[PDB]
Amino acid sequence: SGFRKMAFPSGKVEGCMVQVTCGTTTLNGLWLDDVVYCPRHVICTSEDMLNPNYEDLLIRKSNHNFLVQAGNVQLRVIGHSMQNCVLKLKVDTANPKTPKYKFVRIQPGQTFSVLACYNGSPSGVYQCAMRPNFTIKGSFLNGSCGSVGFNIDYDCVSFCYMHHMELPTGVHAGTDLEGNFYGPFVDRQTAQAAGTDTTITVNVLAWLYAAVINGDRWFLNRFTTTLNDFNLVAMKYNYEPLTQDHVDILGPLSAQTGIAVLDMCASLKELLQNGMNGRTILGSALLEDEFTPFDVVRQCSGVTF
Amino acid sequence: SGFRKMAFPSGKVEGCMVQVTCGTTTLNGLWLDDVVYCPRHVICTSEDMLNPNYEDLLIRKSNHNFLVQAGNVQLRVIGHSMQNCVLKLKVDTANPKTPKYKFVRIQPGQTFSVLACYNGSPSGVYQCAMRPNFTIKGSFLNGSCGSVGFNIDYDCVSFCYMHHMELPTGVHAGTDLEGNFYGPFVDRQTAQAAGTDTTITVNVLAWLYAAVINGDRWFLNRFTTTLNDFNLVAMKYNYEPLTQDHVDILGPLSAQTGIAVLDMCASLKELLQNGMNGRTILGSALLEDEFTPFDVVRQC
Ligand SMILES: O=C(Cc1ccc(Cl)cn1)Nc1cncc2ccccc12
Ligand SMILES: O=C(Cc1ccc(Cl)cn1)Nc1cncc2ccccc12
């Protein structure tokens, strides 16, 4: 019993965190094989950030301008290239702690663990979801740029996020490991705002199933709904549309608890229109949307790595 | 910006998780140097759970009765001893991944990260607080026994908890790494119930300071309170008494935000009276009590 916002064990990722310095800027890098990946804005000055030409800024740099530190060992940079918004620093030493890994781009609603780092040193691990507006509600301070988001599938670390910036609302923006930003964001010091956020409906339903598995049933009702009537309700309360794909993904949880997905949707519909009425679900007075259906199955079944 | 329930990076602890088997029972062990620590109930049978005589059950065991597996490598048990409710299995190999570590016993209200494990394999990491009733609200299934709670402060891993059991309410009970249980619990299947749980007041105040640091001030008021009047009100909402020690501990946050502890106490009194009225504090519709004053300063 119990249900916590649980992150993947971060060990395989901690072995990859290095410190990258370029002039006065110091941030984090991900050392995989003989390449260190970090945000390309590491080559910028505060003036350069206002309107940067990264090809022009990078062409002026030499390998010795990038100081890479893996623990208390300096790694020598033997090459440097840019792929979208990520700088790739070729180093002389392959990371002996390189795990089995992939670079994956995730979709909004998908969750991942963030290993927050400062000066190439991991300081904390938390779980979060890629919001439908492509931001993440992280916890990041100055120097966290280069911190990575990941999932662990069996023995393979799927790197899905690299932290680049904080938006004025306190939410965070970053790229996949190929340097492609999530969302309509650019790595420039300018006016950028995240779009209006929505609730990840499939994730709320997954979390309602987790509450049922944990003995919290007060919100269940005798009712069911059509997928179209539920989506008309979801659209009204800034909830993401629930697709037939989502209904299929919730199938195992529906079979385990004996509550059909559209029956759980009628519970969610009632919760949206009436509220919790002084009650809580899994110790929460809000509907939690940062647990995917896979996270719920994984946690309520003990999958190890 | 942002405020998350953040756990410590678990790598230093993952390198210590091993699987311990005794007969039919399989649980987790913590391999530090040449010793594997695990709950002593690993030696118990089916009818030896209500009133186990651990000294009697352990005297009947030999080293070869304990199978210890570190990854895909079997470790050879060369000794076994019991220290309170923890079994210490001396092995023939020192763990090369042993970090700098300490065994620390924590007080209620303290937080720690839990590395949940099954069959010596880490499956997830989450942040917990030791409840005032000495239980933890963890997320654990069968086979999680032996999973550990820890903090990492300046490269050193302070192990503070080893999971032993789940109480009938779904909350968890365990020991420090010296085998001393937290709370009035025993490692027997006898009827055991946690005392009524209360809110960790100092932690709620720390979290209100975190919200102020993050730009949220809607809940602040023009009132102050005496510590005694605060405690008389807070006690009625099942909040822990706030001691002068707690007021002192909140001093740095009070100085950083410019809000005196007793002024913040008056906001808390008002929040308990009014609720949130549709508002949230740091994305939460409830008052969060699993962030200590130290966690707030560290994260902000
Ligand atoms: O935002 C930047 C630096 C930066 C990078 C790119 C651009 Cl376009 C503009 N600024 N770093 C930070 C990242 N995350 C949280 C942060 C909290 C506080 C301060 C700095 C934080
Ligand atoms: O509580 C026990 C078994 C046990 C150990 C020691 C003593 Cl004295 C009595 N019973 N194990 C478990 C631990 N944590 C979560 C659990 C969820 C579900 C099932 C079993 C769980």
From Swiss-Prot, chain A:
Numbered residues of crosslink Glycyl lysine isopeptide (Lys-Gly) (interchain with G-Cter in ubiquitin): 5, 90
Active site per UniProt: 41 (for 3cl-pro activity), 145 (nucleophile)
Compartments where found: Host cytoplasm; Host Golgi apparatus; Host nucleus
Effect of residue 205 to V: In strain: Zeta/P.2
Effect of residue 90 to R: In strain: Beta/B.1.351
Peptidase C30 domain mapped to chain residues: 1-305
Function: Cleaves the C-terminus of replicase polyprotein at 11 sites. Recognizes substrates containing the core sequence [ILMVF]-Q-|-[SGACN]. Cleaves and inactivates human TRMT1, preventing tRNA guanine(26)-dimethylation of tRNAs. May cleave human NLRP1 in lung epithelial cells, thereby activating the NLRP1 inflammasome pathway. May cleave human GSDMD, triggering alternative GSDME-mediated epithelial cell death upon activation of the NLRP1 inflammasome, which may enhance the release interleukins 1B, 6, 16 and 18. Also able to bind an ADP-ribose-1''-phosphate (ADRP).
Name used for this protein in its record: 3C-like proteinase nsp5
Gene that produces this protein: rep
Segment of the intact protein contained: 3264 to 3568 of 7096
